[PDB]
Amino acid sequence: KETAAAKFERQHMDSSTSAASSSNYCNQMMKSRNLTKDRCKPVNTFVHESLADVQAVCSQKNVACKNGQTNCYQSYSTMSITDCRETGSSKYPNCAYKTTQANKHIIVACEGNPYVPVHFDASV
Template identity: 50%
Template sequence: MALKSLVLFSLLVLVLLVLEGAQPSLAQDFQRKHMDTSNGPFGRTYCNQMMRRRNLLRRTFNTFVHASLAAVQAVCREPNIRCRNGQNNCHRSRNQMSITDCILTRRRPSPNYRTINRRASIIIACVGNPPVPVHFDGSR
């Protein structure tokens, strides 16, 4: 029985270590996909350049948030709301932020994206302690 408990405890520790190690990479992935601290508004070619630069050309839609990382991380402290996938770890920004939506308009011969600059509240999913953004769920 003691051996079984030791094995289960070891597996639990291993899972926790893997999850802890995954959190920074998820946060870094969010930053790569959705953060751009430069100020807009941006011209017609912004999305084409950013989607190529960030290696996001397989995506048909993407949103870049133009705010500091601290401002976006602060959204994680807002009350929880339900995400589109049914999870309850999303948060909506209290204030509107500058964002740019990139919408794929043509895939071939080379991808072309429409650039739409606007202000909106962002909705992000956060995990960890302290919580960090890991998924952009939408905007309103």
Template identity: 50%
Template sequence: MALKSLILFSLLVLVLLVLEGAQPSLAQDFQRKHIDTSNGPFGRHYCNQMMRRRNLLSRTFNTFVHASLAAVQAVCREPNIRCKNGRNNCHRSRNQMSITDCILTRRYPIPNYKTINRKKFIIIACLGNQLYFDQWV
């Protein structure tokens, strides 16, 4: 009976490990949604291409930061500031960063996004290894 329980427990652990490996980490998810290390400025078709390529067509608004994930994660080492939701786990980038905002202008028949290139300070909410855009200023 103990051997049977050990085998079942081992199989359960194996399944959980496989499921964990199949799901992207939170940093990978942030990277997919918001990081593009390409240099801009970008033309008017950039957002249509990127939103399609990154499978983000359900979003009405998205911001891409043109920096490495490490550079964005480094913002979490800046002093804490108050987030829009009132929490104190936000951090403002020390320097302005190149960003591109993608704003949905038409959903049907084919989604169309307006591309806006900017240089802004970004504000990131940091929770452990999780990153969230709070805003840019």
């Protein structure tokens, strides 16, 4: 039901904050974006830039995706991001996440018309 583009926005966009300020940021966002519903999503990255800046990456540096596909693009500049990763003590449904704030380049897979981000590959 959800389109691939809408799923990318829901799972990775957080333009309301400029950076994760507390170590509780991941637990609250993974829950409110509904990523801990049927299970604890193990890893998830949130980008704190406007949707227009993230969408613009689809017209930046064309690179290979880890999967070998070639519709991945690397942002020319670094972006504010938050890495959310389950801790060794996380147990559905008591999902526990480690919050790691950083500033790096993002790599995303783009598709469609319009040509927008549909998958978050990695950050460098």
